[PDB]
């Protein structure tokens, strides 16, 4: 009732204007993605381009905070998520046939527009992607299609969790264990009402059954693996952090209090990459105190087993009265992907046509 | 007082009911082929509506939800409302039978009604041909015309008149007298109506009306290859509705615990006698209740034999942005080849949009 | 007090007028070919707007509705406002003529403006080529760019800038100083505007502005193959509107009758003098009115001989969910072939979004 919701016209407007920016930046990055291109440069180019487009809009309103809601992340092949390298980490260079996931977020007055898309580097004109890339992309895309049709008022998060497994299984792929699609609110990317992928027995017990309601907003995030689908750390350095507002702890230092002060000014409660910090070695230091006492929440770089592919589609959807209204999406082309398998289940075939 | 589609929660309830009506409808059309029992299709629909409405808005333990119009499957010259009792005659679908499937869903009284015509087992790569195609094309283009004419500021009469020229283009006739009703919460049979191809008496019996924003209509197209009169052929009537504008103490003991059941289970929504524990006790307790006008019947009317009746029924919300259709059959216009076409310049332009 | 698209009923009236402007424009486009009197097309289009508005919202008796901009048919290097008197030189359409059709509808003073460019009797399965295709493609890609840029948070200036880049790609120029007005109830000419290719001086005078939800714009793209200037040519002016801010008791009695017929038939919307039966009394009524600033003239304007001007106008509502276009013409892009194309990477991507 105090809360600013998509029940209000001005809020739909901010969501729609960040959505349009998220869609433009994503597409620009996909067009710039070819053999020999630096991932570091695409992460920099996206974060810069988010800032510049947020710069040009709502100029009359000089108090409104706007920018990055999720820093541009570029996770290739069996890498799951959250790769925004530092100027001094090893870079990754896109090879032909590389499977690329681009993930990013934009906000306007704290209303968050999250988008992620998967494609293949320099697919030869007149060909189709085939084999396990085709199987896992096709599968993740149909998972996003089933969620667009199931995440609506009156349905339960559990029905989406199950639809996802039957769809992914149809391609002998596997939704990554325990990943979460969060409810969004003003200034909150990580709402506690969630959809869980492919939960274990522990995760199924600890995760809360919920019913979607009109006026809620979700960042639906589909991550599907060609393999077993349990992501592991593999000592890549975490660059992406979020401040956790739920945690106080006075910091016994000078640098730490000073780094965690630039995190609050420049970013408040949104995720940020350690690369966005002018002076690298100084940020690398101010993080350790903060991260161990949980004031910052890490976004770790997880990997599936070498040779396997992970595909991603993330879209932000507003549960408007008239029906779910999608405000971000990638330039997916269904005809580019040939799989030898399809969905055989009659209920899911009919749902995906609906 | 009246809850209208100017409330965000009401639109939501209409859409969740239509998503369900659309799903049960298609699942019934997939299940329809040579040798399946209409009885079992009617049982399957009604059970799918109850399962689907069972799964939604479950945090809201108190909310009524379920059948707004029990599944009816009216074949060839049958016009509507055929939902056989288990103890009556069944009907087995044949190849080339023209099938109308009518059903409705409600969520907290907000009704989503749909109906659709197809032909049984159309051989792959074949096209329906002849009178069946004429009348299915006609009824559909009558629905396309209504979708574009049922909008705020227009009159019911403009819709009546467009249906007459669209259906004459295929030498078909809208069945005279048939009504398309305004819907409101708990009301399937609003007084505000679109009439088809009315007689001079029916014209004077029926009120010109103007569509207004925030209204809901179950638009209902029934077009015949014949006459366009629908006559009783004494099939037993299986579908009745409580008439909430009516009292009567009733007296006979079966009668009162019968009508006690229709009030507990179905409140104001149409129901089939097939839905009772004992179809015989139900046929008996109706006979008192219906005489005294506490139940309206939904009669099975029939055209002349060898003639064909097509139906498309969709529920539409007159939203500010434009008509928002929440139900529809899966129409494929490529299935149907007619030697005739709509040729009126002004209706061709309407249908193109 | 002011009625905005935040009201369900306002959005409805805009949509009902848009639906009509679309129907009329298309009918006029179909009716344009070699030998067609431009006078007849102006008559036909004004008569259609009155017939179509005559049929809607009949039960609301006090509700004013009809023409927001009289059908104007501006050919080749004519820019705008050609609506000849019965007694003027008529223009007969020739094969290969570039035609601009511009008209408006109002429902209760909610305005739906549209304009469309096409080429007369394009040879079946050819393509228009040369300057006519250059300028029609430039104007359409300008209209497409406006539709994606005129939205809450953006600046009228970014549109102005996109329009010189997009048009320069075809060696075409948006006509210097032409305006796209905000619309409100009974106001065709709101002060918040998008300016085309402003002069030196015009930039000083024109206000920068941010677009916001709930605003309405009649986006008017006017593009020239030549310099992008538009001069008078003492062609009779025929279109005027009443300035509702000026009031004056008139001396002569023909003048007052003239005024009464203007106020009654056209409130404060532009009208053509062609709509007055007594052509003489009206030309005399005007000079007393126009003398005392009671009418503002809409003068006919021309680019140079042999040059071509294209126009796409559309009326858009900045709803919360995104711009909602309620008018458009039937553009078929595959009809126009140009040696040139938009080569800026950001405009390429903006035009595909």
PDB file of C-alpha atoms in Angstrom, chain B residues 51-312:
ATOM      1  CA  UNK B  51      -9.399 -30.210 -12.210  1.00  0.00           C
ATOM      2  CA  UNK B  52      -8.064 -26.939 -13.855  1.00  0.00           C
ATOM      3  CA  UNK B  53     -10.181 -24.580 -11.670  1.00  0.00           C
ATOM      4  CA  UNK B  54      -9.130 -26.762  -8.698  1.00  0.00           C
ATOM      5  CA  UNK B  55      -5.402 -25.818  -9.269  1.00  0.00           C
ATOM      6  CA  UNK B  56      -5.825 -21.978  -9.446  1.00  0.00           C
ATOM      7  CA  UNK B  57      -6.152 -19.404  -6.609  1.00  0.00           C
ATOM      8  CA  UNK B  58      -5.768 -22.160  -3.961  1.00  0.00           C
ATOM      9  CA  UNK B  59      -4.470 -19.674  -1.316  1.00  0.00           C
ATOM     10  CA  UNK B  60      -8.107 -18.368  -1.668  1.00  0.00           C
ATOM     11  CA  UNK B  61      -9.821 -21.466  -0.035  1.00  0.00           C
ATOM     12  CA  UNK B  62     -13.223 -19.621  -0.010  1.00  0.00           C
ATOM     13  CA  UNK B  63     -13.450 -18.692  -3.784  1.00  0.00           C
ATOM     14  CA  UNK B  64     -16.151 -20.444  -5.844  1.00  0.00           C
ATOM     15  CA  UNK B  65     -14.830 -21.601  -9.286  1.00  0.00           C
ATOM     16  CA  UNK B  66     -15.875 -24.280 -11.843  1.00  0.00           C
ATOM     17  CA  UNK B  67     -18.349 -24.965 -14.681  1.00  0.00           C
ATOM     18  CA  UNK B  68     -20.252 -21.959 -16.072  1.00  0.00           C
ATOM     19  CA  UNK B  69     -21.671 -23.986 -18.988  1.00  0.00           C
ATOM     20  CA  UNK B  70     -21.452 -27.789 -18.969  1.00  0.00           C
ATOM     21  CA  UNK B  71     -19.742 -29.341 -22.025  1.00  0.00           C
ATOM     22  CA  UNK B  72     -22.206 -29.827 -24.932  1.00  0.00           C
ATOM     23  CA  UNK B  73     -21.379 -31.510 -28.281  1.00  0.00           C
ATOM     24  CA  UNK B  74     -24.082 -30.833 -30.913  1.00  0.00           C
ATOM     25  CA  UNK B  75     -23.421 -32.706 -34.157  1.00  0.00           C
ATOM     26  CA  UNK B  76     -24.561 -31.899 -37.735  1.00  0.00           C
ATOM     27  CA  UNK B  77     -28.167 -30.443 -37.632  1.00  0.00           C
ATOM     28  CA  UNK B  78     -28.339 -30.430 -33.811  1.00  0.00           C
ATOM     29  CA  UNK B  79     -27.993 -26.663 -32.922  1.00  0.00           C
ATOM     30  CA  UNK B  80     -26.883 -26.743 -29.213  1.00  0.00           C
ATOM     31  CA  UNK B  81     -27.169 -28.033 -25.611  1.00  0.00           C
ATOM     32  CA  UNK B  82     -26.734 -31.845 -26.215  1.00  0.00           C
ATOM     33  CA  UNK B  83     -25.115 -33.272 -22.980  1.00  0.00           C
ATOM     34  CA  UNK B  84     -26.546 -36.799 -22.712  1.00  0.00           C
ATOM     35  CA  UNK B  85     -27.366 -38.535 -19.420  1.00  0.00           C
ATOM     36  CA  UNK B  86     -25.560 -41.879 -18.873  1.00  0.00           C
ATOM     37  CA  UNK B  87     -29.139 -43.454 -18.821  1.00  0.00           C
ATOM     38  CA  UNK B  88     -30.220 -41.779 -22.194  1.00  0.00           C
ATOM     39  CA  UNK B  89     -28.972 -42.497 -25.759  1.00  0.00           C
ATOM     40  CA  UNK B  90     -25.235 -41.830 -26.431  1.00  0.00           C
ATOM     41  CA  UNK B  91     -23.955 -40.734 -29.904  1.00  0.00           C
ATOM     42  CA  UNK B  92     -20.766 -42.082 -31.579  1.00  0.00           C
ATOM     43  CA  UNK B  93     -18.797 -39.666 -33.796  1.00  0.00           C
ATOM     44  CA  UNK B  94     -18.312 -40.696 -37.506  1.00  0.00           C
ATOM     45  CA  UNK B  95     -15.698 -39.371 -40.027  1.00  0.00           C
ATOM     46  CA  UNK B  96     -17.074 -36.145 -41.611  1.00  0.00           C
ATOM     47  CA  UNK B  97     -19.475 -35.346 -38.725  1.00  0.00           C
ATOM     48  CA  UNK B  98     -19.605 -31.551 -38.155  1.00  0.00           C
ATOM     49  CA  UNK B  99     -19.108 -31.090 -34.324  1.00  0.00           C
ATOM     50  CA  UNK B 100     -19.891 -27.976 -32.197  1.00  0.00           C
ATOM     51  CA  UNK B 101     -18.238 -28.051 -28.695  1.00  0.00           C
ATOM     52  CA  UNK B 102     -19.729 -25.455 -26.339  1.00  0.00           C
ATOM     53  CA  UNK B 103     -18.509 -25.042 -22.726  1.00  0.00           C
ATOM     54  CA  UNK B 104     -17.987 -22.313 -20.088  1.00  0.00           C
ATOM     55  CA  UNK B 105     -15.688 -21.788 -17.047  1.00  0.00           C
ATOM     56  CA  UNK B 106     -16.192 -19.346 -14.132  1.00  0.00           C
ATOM     57  CA  UNK B 107     -13.802 -17.913 -11.485  1.00  0.00           C
ATOM     58  CA  UNK B 108     -15.655 -16.177  -8.543  1.00  0.00           C
ATOM     59  CA  UNK B 109     -18.691 -15.829 -10.880  1.00  0.00           C
ATOM     60  CA  UNK B 110     -16.753 -14.192 -13.775  1.00  0.00           C
ATOM     61  CA  UNK B 111     -17.696 -16.308 -16.834  1.00  0.00           C
ATOM     62  CA  UNK B 112     -15.558 -17.285 -19.916  1.00  0.00           C
ATOM     63  CA  UNK B 113     -17.740 -19.072 -22.544  1.00  0.00           C
ATOM     64  CA  UNK B 114     -16.356 -20.595 -25.815  1.00  0.00           C
ATOM     65  CA  UNK B 115     -17.570 -22.751 -28.697  1.00  0.00           C
ATOM     66  CA  UNK B 116     -15.922 -24.103 -31.867  1.00  0.00           C
ATOM     67  CA  UNK B 117     -16.862 -26.155 -34.992  1.00  0.00           C
ATOM     68  CA  UNK B 118     -14.599 -28.747 -36.690  1.00  0.00           C
ATOM     69  CA  UNK B 119     -15.175 -31.819 -38.868  1.00  0.00           C
ATOM     70  CA  UNK B 120     -14.200 -35.325 -37.549  1.00  0.00           C
ATOM     71  CA  UNK B 121     -11.037 -36.967 -38.959  1.00  0.00           C
ATOM     72  CA  UNK B 122     -10.325 -34.706 -41.984  1.00  0.00           C
ATOM     73  CA  UNK B 123      -7.835 -36.910 -43.959  1.00  0.00           C
ATOM     74  CA  UNK B 124      -4.305 -35.249 -43.827  1.00  0.00           C
ATOM     75  CA  UNK B 125      -3.755 -32.918 -46.893  1.00  0.00           C
ATOM     76  CA  UNK B 126      -7.548 -32.881 -47.648  1.00  0.00           C
ATOM     77  CA  UNK B 127      -9.785 -29.782 -47.387  1.00  0.00           C
ATOM     78  CA  UNK B 128     -13.425 -29.803 -46.199  1.00  0.00           C
ATOM     79  CA  UNK B 129     -15.669 -29.027 -49.219  1.00  0.00           C
ATOM     80  CA  UNK B 130     -19.332 -28.286 -50.000  1.00  0.00           C
ATOM     81  CA  UNK B 131     -22.100 -27.226 -47.567  1.00  0.00           C
ATOM     82  CA  UNK B 132     -19.953 -28.058 -44.482  1.00  0.00           C
ATOM     83  CA  UNK B 133     -17.221 -25.582 -45.637  1.00  0.00           C
ATOM     84  CA  UNK B 134     -19.855 -22.996 -46.712  1.00  0.00           C
ATOM     85  CA  UNK B 135     -21.458 -22.857 -43.250  1.00  0.00           C
ATOM     86  CA  UNK B 136     -18.142 -23.164 -41.239  1.00  0.00           C
ATOM     87  CA  UNK B 137     -16.557 -20.324 -43.310  1.00  0.00           C
ATOM     88  CA  UNK B 138     -19.798 -18.249 -42.866  1.00  0.00           C
ATOM     89  CA  UNK B 139     -20.079 -18.728 -39.079  1.00  0.00           C
ATOM     90  CA  UNK B 140     -16.360 -17.902 -38.680  1.00  0.00           C
ATOM     91  CA  UNK B 141     -16.488 -14.717 -40.787  1.00  0.00           C
ATOM     92  CA  UNK B 142     -19.608 -13.803 -38.752  1.00  0.00           C
ATOM     93  CA  UNK B 143     -17.396 -14.199 -35.617  1.00  0.00           C
ATOM     94  CA  UNK B 144     -14.551 -12.160 -37.223  1.00  0.00           C
ATOM     95  CA  UNK B 145     -17.100  -9.421 -38.095  1.00  0.00           C
ATOM     96  CA  UNK B 146     -18.539  -9.309 -34.506  1.00  0.00           C
ATOM     97  CA  UNK B 147     -15.016  -9.221 -32.989  1.00  0.00           C
ATOM     98  CA  UNK B 148     -14.559  -5.928 -34.950  1.00  0.00           C
ATOM     99  CA  UNK B 149     -18.167  -4.536 -34.531  1.00  0.00           C
ATOM    100  CA  UNK B 150     -18.859  -5.375 -30.860  1.00  0.00           C
ATOM    101  CA  UNK B 151     -17.007  -2.271 -29.525  1.00  0.00           C
ATOM    102  CA  UNK B 152     -18.042   0.832 -27.468  1.00  0.00           C
ATOM    103  CA  UNK B 153     -20.370   3.222 -29.362  1.00  0.00           C
ATOM    104  CA  UNK B 154     -21.724   0.670 -31.814  1.00  0.00           C
ATOM    105  CA  UNK B 155     -25.242  -0.859 -31.746  1.00  0.00           C
ATOM    106  CA  UNK B 156     -26.319  -4.488 -31.460  1.00  0.00           C
ATOM    107  CA  UNK B 157     -28.322  -3.860 -34.676  1.00  0.00           C
ATOM    108  CA  UNK B 158     -25.106  -3.236 -36.837  1.00  0.00           C
ATOM    109  CA  UNK B 159     -23.863  -6.738 -35.793  1.00  0.00           C
ATOM    110  CA  UNK B 160     -27.241  -8.438 -36.625  1.00  0.00           C
ATOM    111  CA  UNK B 161     -27.097  -6.778 -40.096  1.00  0.00           C
ATOM    112  CA  UNK B 162     -23.431  -7.729 -40.884  1.00  0.00           C
ATOM    113  CA  UNK B 163     -24.139 -11.420 -39.948  1.00  0.00           C
ATOM    114  CA  UNK B 164     -27.079 -11.475 -42.424  1.00  0.00           C
ATOM    115  CA  UNK B 165     -24.824 -10.289 -45.369  1.00  0.00           C
ATOM    116  CA  UNK B 166     -21.790 -12.407 -44.358  1.00  0.00           C
ATOM    117  CA  UNK B 167     -23.931 -15.547 -44.010  1.00  0.00           C
ATOM    118  CA  UNK B 168     -25.995 -14.819 -47.312  1.00  0.00           C
ATOM    119  CA  UNK B 169     -22.545 -14.674 -49.110  1.00  0.00           C
ATOM    120  CA  UNK B 170     -22.338 -18.478 -48.497  1.00  0.00           C
ATOM    121  CA  UNK B 171     -26.133 -19.109 -49.080  1.00  0.00           C
ATOM    122  CA  UNK B 172     -26.280 -19.754 -45.263  1.00  0.00           C
ATOM    123  CA  UNK B 173     -28.653 -18.209 -42.685  1.00  0.00           C
ATOM    124  CA  UNK B 174     -28.093 -17.181 -39.036  1.00  0.00           C
ATOM    125  CA  UNK B 175     -30.622 -19.151 -36.938  1.00  0.00           C
ATOM    126  CA  UNK B 176     -33.419 -16.668 -36.152  1.00  0.00           C
ATOM    127  CA  UNK B 177     -34.002 -15.474 -32.535  1.00  0.00           C
ATOM    128  CA  UNK B 178     -30.656 -16.782 -31.092  1.00  0.00           C
ATOM    129  CA  UNK B 179     -29.199 -14.423 -28.440  1.00  0.00           C
ATOM    130  CA  UNK B 180     -25.599 -13.247 -27.546  1.00  0.00           C
ATOM    131  CA  UNK B 181     -25.768 -12.101 -23.836  1.00  0.00           C
ATOM    132  CA  UNK B 182     -23.950  -9.461 -21.778  1.00  0.00           C
ATOM    133  CA  UNK B 183     -22.108 -11.273 -18.904  1.00  0.00           C
ATOM    134  CA  UNK B 184     -21.776  -9.956 -15.364  1.00  0.00           C
ATOM    135  CA  UNK B 185     -20.521 -11.540 -12.133  1.00  0.00           C
ATOM    136  CA  UNK B 186     -22.809 -14.609 -11.489  1.00  0.00           C
ATOM    137  CA  UNK B 187     -24.976 -13.748 -14.591  1.00  0.00           C
ATOM    138  CA  UNK B 188     -24.601 -15.850 -17.811  1.00  0.00           C
ATOM    139  CA  UNK B 189     -27.835 -14.409 -19.326  1.00  0.00           C
ATOM    140  CA  UNK B 190     -27.658 -10.545 -19.125  1.00  0.00           C
ATOM    141  CA  UNK B 191     -30.713  -8.711 -20.504  1.00  0.00           C
ATOM    142  CA  UNK B 192     -28.501  -6.674 -22.888  1.00  0.00           C
ATOM    143  CA  UNK B 193     -28.259  -8.885 -26.046  1.00  0.00           C
ATOM    144  CA  UNK B 194     -27.258  -9.255 -29.740  1.00  0.00           C
ATOM    145  CA  UNK B 195     -30.073 -11.092 -31.639  1.00  0.00           C
ATOM    146  CA  UNK B 196     -29.526 -13.089 -34.902  1.00  0.00           C
ATOM    147  CA  UNK B 197     -31.681 -12.698 -38.034  1.00  0.00           C
ATOM    148  CA  UNK B 198     -34.777 -11.788 -36.020  1.00  0.00           C
ATOM    149  CA  UNK B 199     -38.371 -12.184 -37.348  1.00  0.00           C
ATOM    150  CA  UNK B 200     -40.588  -8.994 -37.458  1.00  0.00           C
ATOM    151  CA  UNK B 201     -42.166 -10.151 -34.106  1.00  0.00           C
ATOM    152  CA  UNK B 202     -38.693 -10.890 -32.508  1.00  0.00           C
ATOM    153  CA  UNK B 203     -37.445  -7.409 -33.765  1.00  0.00           C
ATOM    154  CA  UNK B 204     -40.261  -5.624 -31.760  1.00  0.00           C
ATOM    155  CA  UNK B 205     -39.671  -8.140 -28.823  1.00  0.00           C
ATOM    156  CA  UNK B 206     -35.969  -7.087 -28.612  1.00  0.00           C
ATOM    157  CA  UNK B 207     -34.239  -3.865 -27.492  1.00  0.00           C
ATOM    158  CA  UNK B 208     -31.705  -1.933 -29.614  1.00  0.00           C
ATOM    159  CA  UNK B 209     -28.736  -1.308 -27.323  1.00  0.00           C
ATOM    160  CA  UNK B 210     -25.322   0.436 -27.590  1.00  0.00           C
ATOM    161  CA  UNK B 211     -22.120  -1.435 -26.440  1.00  0.00           C
ATOM    162  CA  UNK B 212     -20.213   0.485 -23.687  1.00  0.00           C
ATOM    163  CA  UNK B 213     -16.636   0.258 -22.306  1.00  0.00           C
ATOM    164  CA  UNK B 214     -16.309  -2.131 -19.263  1.00  0.00           C
ATOM    165  CA  UNK B 215     -18.968  -4.541 -20.679  1.00  0.00           C
ATOM    166  CA  UNK B 216     -18.394  -8.281 -21.349  1.00  0.00           C
ATOM    167  CA  UNK B 217     -20.302 -10.250 -24.108  1.00  0.00           C
ATOM    168  CA  UNK B 218     -20.309 -13.952 -24.892  1.00  0.00           C
ATOM    169  CA  UNK B 219     -20.714 -13.375 -28.640  1.00  0.00           C
ATOM    170  CA  UNK B 220     -22.430 -16.510 -30.040  1.00  0.00           C
ATOM    171  CA  UNK B 221     -22.598 -17.270 -33.815  1.00  0.00           C
ATOM    172  CA  UNK B 222     -24.956 -20.128 -34.959  1.00  0.00           C
ATOM    173  CA  UNK B 223     -25.310 -20.269 -38.771  1.00  0.00           C
ATOM    174  CA  UNK B 224     -27.379 -22.892 -40.722  1.00  0.00           C
ATOM    175  CA  UNK B 225     -27.032 -24.259 -44.276  1.00  0.00           C
ATOM    176  CA  UNK B 226     -30.876 -24.432 -44.366  1.00  0.00           C
ATOM    177  CA  UNK B 227     -34.020 -22.497 -43.311  1.00  0.00           C
ATOM    178  CA  UNK B 228     -32.406 -21.025 -40.130  1.00  0.00           C
ATOM    179  CA  UNK B 229     -35.361 -22.106 -37.941  1.00  0.00           C
ATOM    180  CA  UNK B 230     -34.496 -24.392 -34.976  1.00  0.00           C
ATOM    181  CA  UNK B 231     -37.445 -26.688 -33.946  1.00  0.00           C
ATOM    182  CA  UNK B 232     -37.856 -28.915 -30.795  1.00  0.00           C
ATOM    183  CA  UNK B 233     -37.573 -32.668 -31.795  1.00  0.00           C
ATOM    184  CA  UNK B 234     -38.311 -33.744 -28.163  1.00  0.00           C
ATOM    185  CA  UNK B 235     -34.758 -34.665 -27.102  1.00  0.00           C
ATOM    186  CA  UNK B 236     -34.763 -34.653 -23.270  1.00  0.00           C
ATOM    187  CA  UNK B 237     -33.325 -31.458 -21.880  1.00  0.00           C
ATOM    188  CA  UNK B 238     -30.239 -32.140 -19.674  1.00  0.00           C
ATOM    189  CA  UNK B 239     -29.203 -28.501 -18.889  1.00  0.00           C
ATOM    190  CA  UNK B 240     -31.103 -26.127 -16.558  1.00  0.00           C
ATOM    191  CA  UNK B 241     -30.209 -22.949 -14.514  1.00  0.00           C
ATOM    192  CA  UNK B 242     -31.681 -21.703 -11.158  1.00  0.00           C
ATOM    193  CA  UNK B 243     -33.595 -18.406 -11.865  1.00  0.00           C
ATOM    194  CA  UNK B 244     -32.617 -16.187  -8.873  1.00  0.00           C
ATOM    195  CA  UNK B 245     -35.604 -13.771  -9.579  1.00  0.00           C
ATOM    196  CA  UNK B 246     -38.112 -16.385  -8.150  1.00  0.00           C
ATOM    197  CA  UNK B 247     -39.458 -18.015  -4.905  1.00  0.00           C
ATOM    198  CA  UNK B 248     -41.503 -21.215  -4.121  1.00  0.00           C
ATOM    199  CA  UNK B 249     -41.616 -23.367  -0.897  1.00  0.00           C
ATOM    200  CA  UNK B 250     -41.761 -26.420  -3.220  1.00  0.00           C
ATOM    201  CA  UNK B 251     -43.210 -28.983  -0.640  1.00  0.00           C
ATOM    202  CA  UNK B 252     -42.529 -32.588  -2.100  1.00  0.00           C
ATOM    203  CA  UNK B 253     -39.496 -34.018  -0.187  1.00  0.00           C
ATOM    204  CA  UNK B 254     -37.330 -35.237  -3.240  1.00  0.00           C
ATOM    205  CA  UNK B 255     -38.006 -31.849  -4.987  1.00  0.00           C
ATOM    206  CA  UNK B 256     -36.669 -29.722  -2.061  1.00  0.00           C
ATOM    207  CA  UNK B 257     -33.424 -31.755  -1.440  1.00  0.00           C
ATOM    208  CA  UNK B 258     -32.945 -31.769  -5.281  1.00  0.00           C
ATOM    209  CA  UNK B 259     -33.181 -27.877  -5.550  1.00  0.00           C
ATOM    210  CA  UNK B 260     -31.194 -27.721  -2.239  1.00  0.00           C
ATOM    211  CA  UNK B 261     -28.457 -29.571  -4.225  1.00  0.00           C
ATOM    212  CA  UNK B 262     -28.589 -27.204  -7.266  1.00  0.00           C
ATOM    213  CA  UNK B 263     -28.266 -24.124  -4.911  1.00  0.00           C
ATOM    214  CA  UNK B 264     -25.380 -25.722  -2.936  1.00  0.00           C
ATOM    215  CA  UNK B 265     -23.398 -26.997  -6.026  1.00  0.00           C
ATOM    216  CA  UNK B 266     -24.259 -24.766  -9.094  1.00  0.00           C
ATOM    217  CA  UNK B 267     -25.753 -21.551  -7.491  1.00  0.00           C
ATOM    218  CA  UNK B 268     -26.774 -19.519 -10.589  1.00  0.00           C
ATOM    219  CA  UNK B 269     -24.784 -21.347 -13.357  1.00  0.00           C
ATOM    220  CA  UNK B 270     -26.216 -23.835 -15.890  1.00  0.00           C
ATOM    221  CA  UNK B 271     -25.727 -27.542 -14.914  1.00  0.00           C
ATOM    222  CA  UNK B 272     -26.382 -31.051 -16.469  1.00  0.00           C
ATOM    223  CA  UNK B 273     -28.570 -33.680 -14.729  1.00  0.00           C
ATOM    224  CA  UNK B 274     -25.692 -36.082 -15.541  1.00  0.00           C
ATOM    225  CA  UNK B 275     -23.737 -34.411 -12.662  1.00  0.00           C
ATOM    226  CA  UNK B 276     -26.003 -36.040 -10.002  1.00  0.00           C
ATOM    227  CA  UNK B 277     -25.450 -39.248  -7.969  1.00  0.00           C
ATOM    228  CA  UNK B 278     -28.917 -40.438  -9.226  1.00  0.00           C
ATOM    229  CA  UNK B 279     -30.003 -39.228 -12.735  1.00  0.00           C
ATOM    230  CA  UNK B 280     -33.538 -40.705 -12.110  1.00  0.00           C
ATOM    231  CA  UNK B 281     -34.048 -38.788  -8.778  1.00  0.00           C
ATOM    232  CA  UNK B 282     -32.696 -35.658 -10.581  1.00  0.00           C
ATOM    233  CA  UNK B 283     -35.107 -36.010 -13.614  1.00  0.00           C
ATOM    234  CA  UNK B 284     -38.056 -36.309 -11.083  1.00  0.00           C
ATOM    235  CA  UNK B 285     -37.131 -33.310  -8.796  1.00  0.00           C
ATOM    236  CA  UNK B 286     -36.676 -31.124 -11.922  1.00  0.00           C
ATOM    237  CA  UNK B 287     -40.288 -31.756 -13.064  1.00  0.00           C
ATOM    238  CA  UNK B 288     -41.748 -29.861  -9.974  1.00  0.00           C
ATOM    239  CA  UNK B 289     -38.981 -27.069  -9.919  1.00  0.00           C
ATOM    240  CA  UNK B 290     -39.267 -26.327 -13.740  1.00  0.00           C
ATOM    241  CA  UNK B 291     -43.143 -26.156 -13.869  1.00  0.00           C
ATOM    242  CA  UNK B 292     -42.968 -23.302 -11.236  1.00  0.00           C
ATOM    243  CA  UNK B 293     -40.182 -21.459 -13.289  1.00  0.00           C
ATOM    244  CA  UNK B 294     -37.383 -21.929 -10.586  1.00  0.00           C
ATOM    245  CA  UNK B 295     -35.260 -23.630 -13.387  1.00  0.00           C
ATOM    246  CA  UNK B 296     -35.032 -22.421 -17.049  1.00  0.00           C
ATOM    247  CA  UNK B 297     -34.285 -25.344 -19.438  1.00  0.00           C
ATOM    248  CA  UNK B 298     -31.559 -25.280 -22.195  1.00  0.00           C
ATOM    249  CA  UNK B 299     -33.422 -27.203 -24.935  1.00  0.00           C
ATOM    250  CA  UNK B 300     -31.696 -29.272 -27.640  1.00  0.00           C
ATOM    251  CA  UNK B 301     -33.060 -27.597 -30.853  1.00  0.00           C
ATOM    252  CA  UNK B 302     -32.595 -29.092 -34.357  1.00  0.00           C
ATOM    253  CA  UNK B 303     -32.532 -27.834 -37.913  1.00  0.00           C
ATOM    254  CA  UNK B 304     -33.892 -30.062 -40.775  1.00  0.00           C
ATOM    255  CA  UNK B 305     -31.865 -33.270 -41.360  1.00  0.00           C
ATOM    256  CA  UNK B 306     -29.079 -33.221 -44.038  1.00  0.00           C
ATOM    257  CA  UNK B 307     -28.451 -29.530 -43.127  1.00  0.00           C
ATOM    258  CA  UNK B 308     -25.506 -28.376 -40.982  1.00  0.00           C
ATOM    259  CA  UNK B 309     -25.195 -25.831 -38.163  1.00  0.00           C
ATOM    260  CA  UNK B 310     -21.796 -24.174 -37.405  1.00  0.00           C
ATOM    261  CA  UNK B 311     -21.010 -22.291 -34.136  1.00  0.00           C
ATOM    262  CA  UNK B 312     -18.192 -20.005 -32.890  1.00  0.00           C
TER     263      UNK B 312
END
